[PDB]
Assembly symmetry: C3
Homo-oligomer: 133 residues x 3
Amino acid sequence: SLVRRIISTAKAPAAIGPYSQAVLVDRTIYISGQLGMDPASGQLVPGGVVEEAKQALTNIGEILKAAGCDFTNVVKATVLLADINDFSAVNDVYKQYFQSSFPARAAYQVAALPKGGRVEIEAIAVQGPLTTA
Amino acid sequence: SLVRRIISTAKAPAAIGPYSQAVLVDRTIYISGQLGMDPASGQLVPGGVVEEAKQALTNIGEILKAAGCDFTNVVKATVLLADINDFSAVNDVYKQYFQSSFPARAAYQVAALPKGGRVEIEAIAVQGPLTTA
Amino acid sequence: SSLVRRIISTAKAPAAIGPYSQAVLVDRTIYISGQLGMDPASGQLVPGGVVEEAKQALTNIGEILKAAGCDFTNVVKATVLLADINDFSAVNDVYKQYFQSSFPARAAYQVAALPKGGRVEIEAIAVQGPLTT
């Protein structure tokens, strides 16, 4: 018998429809893809891909928080871009949220994201305590 | 020593080539991406995205079945679309398979799917018994 | 209880330039970063086209698995990202040469673009043995 619980925080855009912000099953946390949406206005923050990336990571942070975790628990992330040329800029924003023991990752350009977003990020985390390498 | 088992069912399109319909390892189930293909035929069902979506999900339901699971065991799903504008049409179909404790999700438009498919869904499940909070 | 989380690193696989690790072992699951057909010593793509890149990408994944004490039989899920869906056949012929039985679950589709102009990228998930199938 494994425990499964739905993560939900008002500090991140509400999950409207048949999905959850994140699902914690046993020790693993699956987080839905996050866009650069402001939790309050439900709209994408202005500024373009760079600011959208900050918000998307902010949203991920709040979800991790609600699950008793922080960015150090992320083991895998997927960076979806609307334009492969934004790779470098998003990478520099991305590194602002991690110190070391970085997560495994995949990054590429898709044809289009919801709401005309320029970037969407999804991740997988493992609830602590963790005994690093 | 972890137990790994290859899932196979006649109720879903046959894995032709170097892959399996799904792999169950320990208690996590990795299900291969499913298109709206007829199990016996192996051909894309006519009708378009809405029809393909129903078939794809049906195929997933059978895979889960053959693994001793149902839709309540799904913790994460990815919805790949040929057109981001078919999301609502697909979402309406998708919601008919879940009652609560919805899976984490990510949806976006890719450039092209196999066989000119209009939608593809991959999912991750965790074999129960499962106790929610 | 405490879980082990180690960063996999090998000079025999392309260096992870950005803020990510080649792979992350957590408990017994190994999340491997998407691999391009890059030469480990130069960090640049291998000449020859999609087929040559695929071979290199898989050998890159091979070295990463080896450093984690695994081989291709430990892969339970793989995702093949293509720059052109029409290259699926050619990539699949190279792919089948690395797996003999109990193939991993899979998902394959075309994206808009990959880093460095690569023609193929493969990400995978493996589980540390001993595994009983």
